[PDB]
């Protein structure tokens, strides 16, 4: 099975780039993020053609890149979706982990 890459990975499909560190997400199963497609876990970049390649941040289809990173009620938990649950009622953690600005995701 594929190995986790180094920390400091930059997601930069957009003008609001975010750094992702695998080391802080070890408690999450690889396949929770690199989820099954056609029955097999897919480790291709999220925005690969035919995947989440729609850079229209309003799109909520299975192709919406912004959607897969931010929204709730999705088949696999998104960045913000999981972080919301992690922060719970903790407003400082809400700011750190789900804030739209001044957070660990967006400066």
Q: Which residues are annotated as a binding site?
A: 22, 25, 30, 33-35, 46, 51-52, 70, 79, 82-83, 100, 105-106
Which residues are part of a known binding site for heme c?
22, 25, 30, 33-35, 46, 51-52, 70, 79, 82-83, 100, 105-106
Angle, in degrees to the nearest 10, between helices 91-98 and 79-87: 170
Pick the closest to residue 57 from 106, 94, 13 (CA basis). Answer: 13
Can residue 95 be called a binding residue for ligand HEM (CB under 6 A)? no
> Cα separation of 93 and 50, whole Å?
34
CB atoms under 10 Å from CB of 66, counted, come to: 19
Residues lying near ligand HEM in the complex (CB under 6 A) are found at: 2-5, 9, 11-18, 20-22, 24-25, 28, 30, 32-35, 37, 42-48, 50-52, 55, 57, 62, 66, 68-70, 74-80, 82-83, 86, 93, 97-100, 103-106
């Amino acid at each position: 099975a594929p190995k986790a890459p180094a920390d400091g990975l930059k997601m930069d499909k957009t003008k609001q780039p975010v750094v992702f560190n695998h080391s802080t997400h070890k408690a999450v199963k690889c396949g929770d993020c690199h989820h099954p497609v056609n029955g097999k876990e897919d480790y291709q970049k999220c925005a690969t053609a035919g995947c989440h390649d729609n850079m229209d941040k309003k799109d909520k289809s299975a192709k919406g890149y912004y959607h897969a990173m931010h929204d709730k009620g999705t088949k696999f938990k998104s960045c913000v979706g999981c972080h919301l649950e992690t922060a719970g009622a903790d407003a400082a953690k809400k700011k750190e982990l789900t804030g739209c600005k001044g957070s660990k995701c967006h400066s």
